[PDB]
Amino acid sequence: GPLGSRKIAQMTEEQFALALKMSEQEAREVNSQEEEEEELLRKAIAESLNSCRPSDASATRS
Numbered sequence: 001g002p003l004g005s006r007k008i009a010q011m012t013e014e015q016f017a018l019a020l021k022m023s024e025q026e027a028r029e030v031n032s033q034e035e036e037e038e039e040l041l042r043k044a045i046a047e048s049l050n051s052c053r054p055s056d057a058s059a060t061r062s
Contacts, residue, residue, distance in 0.1 A: 011019070023029075
């Protein structure tokens with residue numbers, strides 16, 4: 001085989017349960033937090049575009 005599973009230590013039943021718990025915390029593999037940040041970045045940009053320009057203190061156009 002690739003190396004030899006015969007020399008590879010097998011995981012115990014308890015170890016398997018812990019592995020599942022870790023996946024649940026990460027949802028799967030990638031951090032869901034990163035995805036949320038990306039969404040927030042786009043939302044902020046859209047909001048800025050929808051935001052009107054600030055009033056001129058001098059009252060001068062453009």
